Write a protein that binds this ligand. Sequence first.
Ligand SMILES: Nc1nc2c(ncn2[C@@H]2O[C@H](COP(=O)(O)OP(=O)(O)O)[C@@H](O)[C@H]2O)c(=O)[nH]1
Ligand SMILES: CC1(C)CCCc2sc(N)c(C#N)c21
Ligand SMILES: [Mg+2]
Length: 169
Amino acid sequence: MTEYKLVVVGACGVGKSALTIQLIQNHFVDEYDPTIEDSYRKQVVIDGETCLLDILDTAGQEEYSAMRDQYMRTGEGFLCVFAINNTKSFEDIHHYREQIKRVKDSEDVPMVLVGNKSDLPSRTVDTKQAQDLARSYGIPFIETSAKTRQGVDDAFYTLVREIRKHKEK
Ligand SMILES: Nc1nc2c(ncn2[C@@H]2O[C@H](COP(=O)(O)OP(=O)(O)O)[C@@H](O)[C@H]2O)c(=O)[nH]1
Ligand SMILES: CC1(C)CCCc2sc(N)c(C#N)c21
Ligand SMILES: [Mg+2]
């Protein structure tokens, strides 16, 4: 069966770890270590195909060494996460996209924009502005809540579909 290498990126505290644990283990984790970077495997069924997901949950200070660049190049798809109550994390999206485009040496990288913490009453990033941004990038936009599990499967599943469309080219 096919293996899909997914990388979860985004600013500090947007919910990278919460979304990953939620997908892999079907439970919400409130206090996951903000500095631990790790990978997780899960056999899933997307559409009709049984496939294995290998998800790298990124953390820690950014490092632009040849090694870390070669390591990120390995990723087939990128989950670009911001929190809908953090404007700065939404503006940090550009920079993640540019680093992904650079290491992949392509303008066509499977990618999904994720607006996390949709359950929160505080919202500083409107849905239409994030939708407009993903439209200029030509990528899907999925709103999520790692707390309520809203859109979690949709976010990772859409990314796999994005890798599938890329491979068949
Ligand atoms: N209300 C709410 N809090 C969330 C959500 N996802 C994560 N959090 C909280 O946001 C904080 C940072 O989340 P975390 O997974 O560590 O993010 P990371 O630094 O991006 O890996 C923690 O207090 C989480 O419990 C969500 O969807 N809703
Ligand atoms: C994790 C992230 C910031 C996002 C994905 C593209 C690249 S390439 C590189 N050396 C990185 C680091 N550190 C990254
Ligand atoms: Mg984390």
